[PDB]
Symmetry: D2
Subunit: 492 residues, 4 copies
Amino acid sequence: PSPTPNLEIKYTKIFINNEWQNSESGRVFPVYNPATGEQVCEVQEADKADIDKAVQAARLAFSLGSVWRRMDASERGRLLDKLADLVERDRAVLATMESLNGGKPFLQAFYVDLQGVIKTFRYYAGWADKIHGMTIPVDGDYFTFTRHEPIGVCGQIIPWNFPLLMFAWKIAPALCCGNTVVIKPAEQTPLSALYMGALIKEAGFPPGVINILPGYGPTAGAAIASHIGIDKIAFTGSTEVGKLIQEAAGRSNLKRVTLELGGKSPNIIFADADLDYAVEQAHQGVFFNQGQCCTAGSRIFVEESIYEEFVRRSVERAKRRVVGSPFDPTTEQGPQIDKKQYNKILELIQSGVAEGAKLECGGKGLGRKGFFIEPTVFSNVTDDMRIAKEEIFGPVQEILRFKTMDEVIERANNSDFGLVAAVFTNDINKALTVSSAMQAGTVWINCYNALNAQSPFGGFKMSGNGREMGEFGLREYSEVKTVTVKIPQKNS
Amino acid sequence: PSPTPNLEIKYTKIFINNEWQNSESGRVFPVYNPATGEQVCEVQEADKADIDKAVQAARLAFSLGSVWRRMDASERGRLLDKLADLVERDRAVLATMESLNGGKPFLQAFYVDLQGVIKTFRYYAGWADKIHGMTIPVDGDYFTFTRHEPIGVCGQIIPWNFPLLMFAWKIAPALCCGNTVVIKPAEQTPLSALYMGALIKEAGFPPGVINILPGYGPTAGAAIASHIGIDKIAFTGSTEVGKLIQEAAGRSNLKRVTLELGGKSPNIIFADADLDYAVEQAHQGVFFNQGQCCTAGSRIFVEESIYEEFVRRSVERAKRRVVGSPFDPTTEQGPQIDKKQYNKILELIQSGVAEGAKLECGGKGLGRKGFFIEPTVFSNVTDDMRIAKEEIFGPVQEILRFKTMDEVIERANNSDFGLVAAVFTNDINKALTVSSAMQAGTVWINCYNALNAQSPFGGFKMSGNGREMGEFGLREYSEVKTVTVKIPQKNS
Amino acid sequence: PSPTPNLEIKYTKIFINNEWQNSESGRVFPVYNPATGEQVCEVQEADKADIDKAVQAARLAFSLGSVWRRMDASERGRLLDKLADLVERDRAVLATMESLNGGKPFLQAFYVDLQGVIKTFRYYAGWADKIHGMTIPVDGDYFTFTRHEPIGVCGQIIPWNFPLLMFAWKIAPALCCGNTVVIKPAEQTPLSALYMGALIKEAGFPPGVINILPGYGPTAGAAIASHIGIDKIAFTGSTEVGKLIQEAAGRSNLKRVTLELGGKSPNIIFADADLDYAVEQAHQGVFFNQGQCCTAGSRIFVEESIYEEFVRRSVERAKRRVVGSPFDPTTEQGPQIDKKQYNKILELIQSGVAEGAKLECGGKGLGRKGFFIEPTVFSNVTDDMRIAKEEIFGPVQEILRFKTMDEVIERANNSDFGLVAAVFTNDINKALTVSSAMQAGTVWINCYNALNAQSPFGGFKMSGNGREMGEFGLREYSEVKTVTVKIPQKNS
Amino acid sequence: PSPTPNLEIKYTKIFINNEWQNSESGRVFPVYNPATGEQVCEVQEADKADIDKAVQAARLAFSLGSVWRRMDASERGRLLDKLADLVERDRAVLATMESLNGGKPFLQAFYVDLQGVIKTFRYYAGWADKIHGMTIPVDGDYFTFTRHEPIGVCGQIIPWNFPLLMFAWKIAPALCCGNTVVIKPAEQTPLSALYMGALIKEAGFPPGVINILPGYGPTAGAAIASHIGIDKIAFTGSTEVGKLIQEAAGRSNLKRVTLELGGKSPNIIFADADLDYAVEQAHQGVFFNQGQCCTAGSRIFVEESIYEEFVRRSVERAKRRVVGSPFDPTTEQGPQIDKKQYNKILELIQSGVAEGAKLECGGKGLGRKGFFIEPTVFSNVTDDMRIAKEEIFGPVQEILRFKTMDEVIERANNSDFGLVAAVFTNDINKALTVSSAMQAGTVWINCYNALNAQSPFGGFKMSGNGREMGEFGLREYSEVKTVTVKIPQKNS
Ligand SMILES: CS(=O)(=O)c1ccc(-c2nn(-c3ccc(C#N)cc3)cc2C(=O)Nc2cccc(F)c2)cc1
Ligand SMILES: CS(=O)(=O)c1ccc(-c2nn(-c3ccc(C#N)cc3)cc2C(=O)Nc2cccc(F)c2)cc1
């Protein structure tokens, strides 16, 4: 498969009540190609004026007697299935948008990102009419049962590293439970989300059920975060910004909050692991999606006996990593998202050099246009170094060394982040000892980034609150109502 | 049974690491008898220095490979079953200690409060080894499972409405999941919790698993909220302080938060019901626990056919409600908790007379000695009156009128709270339409505040976040960890 | 919608390994139009020889490393969704087949049976990747989890009253869990099942996963019931044959057994109920699909206060019930399935007149061709009469009177059949009383025949073993394997 | 703990309605200690007349509105926890009378059989109030929920090799769900079950909730199977009788059947495991309880590299096992249950020495101090010997040899039995591939026989139907009833 030639950007307006609207201020903002820097198009810039309108529509679409509220639970699933069909039909167009907007390699956005989007919508389409309450045997002459209802208007804010995928992970479980959505995609990458508005209208969702508002964080985002008519907010996923999301939630109307924040995920490589397999898996664990994943990956602990051999082949693998244009089927790594990310990475690269880390390869930017960075590897990294803490959303792999399994566990847990961990060993005792001792929401054994629509995802400690994906992602978007009836009889 | 004669307050210290301690400052605050104003005793006053030492004890008792961690989950239940036995043994003392401290009648404290305290422990004693994760059939050659691990150190702040019940409702699920507890009772009523520390040590819980710290809210409670070493705060109290708890969690720790806030809960009485049963149940929905209940039936909606009849028996019975010492067996209504709330119950009962509301009996007090307030009935209330919109933690009963069911549904959900609602009818259709239409976490049909260890609670909107009790109460003290293992084949 | 004009019966051979085979004996058997008595086509007759080939085809398709065993669970759902897509395209053809071969009125086969067929496949298409095991916190240093694996080859026998719907109800849950199927439709109505064989091959199901063998009971059915290579049997039909299935299973290989055996389901009409609603619903619960429903409300208990006028309204409703050709849109009632059922109904109608029942209307066969019978009503049918005890599969309504809820509860339960119940009342206490105090797998309140893909349904006593549909239908097609790992330290 | 000195069998009569009765015939049957051959006491011999009397008692205690029905589910749990207390109190008495009757070493019966009994009662004491149904979101104006209700009278037939452990594993889940029980202990060892009848009436269970009917299989056991007043049967015994049980059930009233038939469980041991640990767990895998376990533990495969070192340390441990009297503390092996069981395994011991298999030790006995067969170790056994395929419930170890993981999985699955498996290895991929490829209900990794109260236990293939001893054990004793109510409007 190949990218769409030229490709027209048809959808650049605000999506409210299934109509394309201009911004109330008339303003727009540009969207760039991170591989070249060219301005790709311009998008309506939503502000508090537009956010209030979408909440108004989402509230009306959620009132009793509404088509969305009345709709059979199985029919909410059929709409999700219909949406997944339109995404598969336009799988090549949406993958091209993700490449042009996010700098992701095309074949990556086609076989990974778009695959996850389709499978997420298909998975949650099956959960619609299977969200069960319970009947409970309470003391006394009572009949007590439990109803799971939708909370209401759900404001959602998603980031730029996985634009379409995060868009799916946010709306699929929320619609599955019958909520209405007001979602703001990242200002850098709003194109794939706006195209989703066209498919949503094509699938037949009632008006106002899904309202997409592109705009900036301090404007549209802060309007959502403190809106008194919004009942639940879901944010992804900077740990710093997430502090204010949960700050404005409590100061406004006490929304229920879900967070999917960052992490400095460790990756333990015991000496008794498939060496050729571990070096490639730890490399893809760091360098996938230009290092722009919350599930990196940065801290790689390797046992000393195989440390110098692991470092050697990791450097060989990093040097041959093909960095180039996203539309090229040989490219493995695209550019970074923007200049601010590009600057912050090179700063963090220079901090490691100025602190005793061995720069084995790379170290600076690539080319003159866009935001390409060399695949770089820092050796002899210690726990106190600046690059040891501080997540680096870039292609920088950092290899540490360790003795004793008890030491690597204490160090890998010695962190305020607890999103993800990965251990590589062939001893079942070592694998289950570490995985049960890790303070992380997802722990992979002999793999990395093994994500799926069936397995829940989310971090420990300051890596987020609540879990997405799987059945446990449905618990974020429901509200338990208990009903107790006085019974004359009461029998078993 | 009979109140314990000449009972001394043996435990007035601070419970850290299964030991009694003084304030690091040496400060001390007094506890009062609201039926009399007498100073009961003096308790140590904890603060940031003492809270820090409680977190250190709780963090060590939660350490990997601790006694509390390696312990079989089944013995976690037998430890909680043992606590229930000690409470059952010392039942008369605790009901006495709750009567002298909280101002509740001894027999109600004996038959209601402690019956629920005992049941809550025995209930969660069985859940301890029945906390289940899941193995997920997932795409690709993988084997994915989850394990429900305890979050960690849990800070808990309970009010004075039910000093012992709220204490049990908090620590029972937390310890059942395997957490450590840094709990802070209310300033007015910290004694029943301090005796529990003795039973806790007597039962055999390892030192540090439960830390009881009496003190002031803005002094000790804020130290729990802002402590970077606490993984989760669970708060029950006023809605305004719950917003700060929400804000204090985002400003510092991003800890998981469970709030349980105010009420102002509707009580819909239909014409086809039993007036004799509905009058008394609605009367006990207001005046139970001296009107100091988050689930108090504030607004009563009576059908137009039977309203003036409803008020007649209501006011009639409300003149027979005995208000006396909480130790006389005939007494049903004790005193209000203290002077700040005593004056507040009256400033708003003045607002009722000041507005179009029509008083039908009481409204002043008794002189007496403590903080006793007359059983007051109001009538011909309108929806916009301040009193039909202010959470009154006092024995005042406001009785409205309604015509159609569609009107009473809109008038009931028109409030920012949403903890509780109740319907009284014999019609199957009216009982089910109204019960589903309400926006509350708990809906009763032909009963009121019939709670149990089973079934969750609750509830909606600005009244709380999450649910205690039932199975779902456990979900707020667990932590879901996903483990994915690469497998060579994957069959089935 | 209109029936397909002159319909080709294209698929009349045995379906094994996604191929069309002739009978090893070379025999064929005829299929008849129950409304005209004329022959429709000839079908290959499956015997013990053909059953043997199907078993080894289904056994081979279930072997480790096969396509069906290694396929993602989500893809087993994709194939089920595609199968539902192919049914909705050929919805008019299959409804024509079922109307032609079963005597059902066309519009009712199009809007009820075919709707349930589609909704069933869609519902179970979602369950595939959502069948979860559990992780259990057991005593000692262990890690215990559970997998739900498919049982293996499932033999299934379905009746003739809902040929297509029973076909979907049986193969959807079995395929959802990953089993292979050997299914034998009733000899009277094998055609729509054989057309499903073509859709299965078109949908892309691997060969041998589904095998359809049309034939007779003592030949095809008996060979399935006693096959040593078949792991589970699922029979739906008469209670008499249900005893032989559970017997042959014990004599062969102790294969698991599911039974749906029907019964004599009561319908209780209280004077508190909507009379005109209950008259119409209870008349639908007796006469639906020519009275050939296992859930038929054969015994209608009516309160004496409204007995004589409920009876009269029912007689008027029966006298205007339109009987005619299944292809005519005005027809509500078609013919019975064959001469054997036709005679059994006419003999039971004679027993009612003999034992002293008031034949209020109808009671004799209508016309010369086909197997049409007049709508029939009885009265004062005391519990000892034969029509009150024996299950009638015909358009015969039987009305009893009662005096007390406690009396009608005991009378309705006095039966070896406990499949389905129904109470009509507007009081919630009476609705809770009967529904909880009855021995029936499904209790409908103020409705009848409200079947879903989401609700279980099954027998209590001699009316079946286990359930189908809902979540609980899946547990009858899954083996639970427990895996326990000795782990080093174990930290709960 | 020492065995009770001169214990007298106080309880010798049949237990019906919490009363001791004699047999309706007056016939009695003698019970023997197989470690002395001397007759110990005489027990009333139950038969059809006594079985009919117990069913009528069991049916009345289950009738609607009874004490057992109306009783709160949580108090059903308190009654179970009370039984566990009395068992731990009379722990010594129940221990010695299990060694006197069953013939097991006293400290084994004290620290194994009794530990399992107390944990089983206390594990199911918590499940009683936590059996939940579910509310279903179905299509249309309906509200659908399910209730998990007890089936009714349940007949149980435990074997002789774990009289008290099987007694708890049977009645605890049944009573947990609210059933009534008619249980028949083994004719070889009925005494400890009879004492439990005293502890039952001591604990306070209503009369008739549990009835103990000591007798013979072909006499009283068959009266349970063929009784039309019993809604469900649970066997546990030999595969041959279990086939007859499902025939007697299908021939009568279609009662639900769950069997625990046991068989030839394999045990794989790879060369990368600790030999000290592997040979010891393999010894106790087939030598525990004098080899009279369903698991067993029979076919022990060993990799080539360590086979002739495995047998060296095995025959060391075999001739080191101190056989003797059950009361001697230094005794590890006891006597077989009786002479016919003693006679069949010697008939099979010669069916290896004569079938070409090599013997390593034992193979005779030690006199006639009882029915003692000395620790015997085989070697060089092939798969199609009568020894490696049949019912050797004695202390016979069968050490096989295998080469490839693929080969031993075929050779281990090649069995009509397959109740349990076990694999010893440190390789993560080996332990995962083998454990998933096994056709067994329980498979252990680096352990054996590690049964716990929390984990379900059952059999695959022909040993056979149903699961017990977990959450899923509850499913076996509950009936699912669906309740659907027509509501005025959806709103979902
Ligand atoms: C959240 S709350 O602080 O607002 C509150 C509200 C109501 C009650 C309450 N109230 N009553 C009550 C009793 C009698 C009458 C009368 N006449 C009126 C009310 C009973 C309860 C109650 O929870 N029981 C209970 C029972 C079993 C287990 C358990 F854990 C708790 C307690 C606290
Ligand atoms: C179904 S069965 O009749 O085939 C059978 C099989 C194994 C055992 C068994 N065996 N052992 C065992 C003990 C020691 C040694 C040694 N050395 C070897 C095996 C322990 C058990 C056992 O169930 N424990 C248990 C523990 C806690 C709770 C509970 F509910 C059950 C019992 C019956």
